Amino acid sequence: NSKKVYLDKLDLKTEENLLPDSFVCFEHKGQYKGTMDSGQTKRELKSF
Amino acid sequence: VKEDQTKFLKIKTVSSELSCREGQSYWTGSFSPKCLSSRRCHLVGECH
Ligand SMILES: *[C@@H]1O[C@H](CO)[C@@H](O)[C@H](O)[C@H]1NC(C)=O
């Protein structure tokens, strides 16, 4: 609920948490009992 | 020739002063610092 705010200084800090956006979930291609469960000619990952 | 010419050149001694012969020099002023801070958790960026 504001406009652009220019600053003279950039003092910023980050705090961690356990919300879903903090986790990177992946899967393998050709992985047994998973999505894309078929023979692959290359070892690549897939998003989850 | 008498009653003619008679030109006068005068050397007035205004003042005698003991002037200074400067050697090295530098400049200075008033300074104030400004700091930008950024806090990151371990293994983030270069937080090793
Ligand atoms: C995760 O952290 C930084 C990114 O902020 C990255 O440079 C680093 O290599 C990563 N650490 C791993 C992959 O272990």
Summarize the structure.
With 48 residues, the first copy, chain A, is mostly beta strands. Chain A is 0% helix and 17% strand. Chain A contains no helices and three strands.
Q: Return Rg of chain A in Å.
A: 20 Å
Biggest chain pair interface: A-B, 7 and 9 residues
Multimerization status: part of a larger assembly
Count the strands of chain A? 3
Strands side by side in the biggest sheet of chain A: 2-3
Major sheet of chain A, described briefly? 2 strands, antiparallel
Global morphology of chain A: elongated
Total helix count of chain A?
Answer: 0
* Structural class label of chain A: mainly beta
Helix content of chain A: under 10%
Distance between the termini of chain A: 33 Å
Portion in strands of chain A: 15-25%
H/E order of the elements of chain A?
EEE
Bound molecules: 2-acetamido-2-deoxy-beta-D-glucopyranose
Task: List strands and helices in order, with pairings.
The structure is cut from a larger assembly and holds two copies of chain A (48 residues).
Chain A: E1 12-13, E2 26-28, E3 45-47
Antiparallel strand pairs in A: 2-3
The structure holds 2-acetamido-2-deoxy-beta-D-glucopyranose.
Any key phrases for this structure?
binds 2-acetamido-2-deoxy-beta-D-glucopyranose; mainly beta; 2 chains; 48 residues; two-stranded antiparallel sheet; part of a larger assembly
Report on this model:
The structure is cut from a larger assembly and holds 2 copies of chain A (48 residues). Chain A has 48 residues and is mainly beta. In chain A, 0% of the residues lie in helices and 17% in strands. The first copy, chain A, contains no helices and 3 strands. Chain A has a two-stranded antiparallel ribbon with strand order 2-3. The A-B interface holds A 9-14, 16 and B 34-41, 44. Bound molecules: 2-acetamido-2-deoxy-beta-D-glucopyranose. Chain A: This is Envelopment polyprotein. Chain A: Belongs to the phlebovirus envelope glycoprotein family. Chain A: It is found in: Host Golgi apparatus membrane; Host endoplasmic reticulum membrane; Virion membrane.
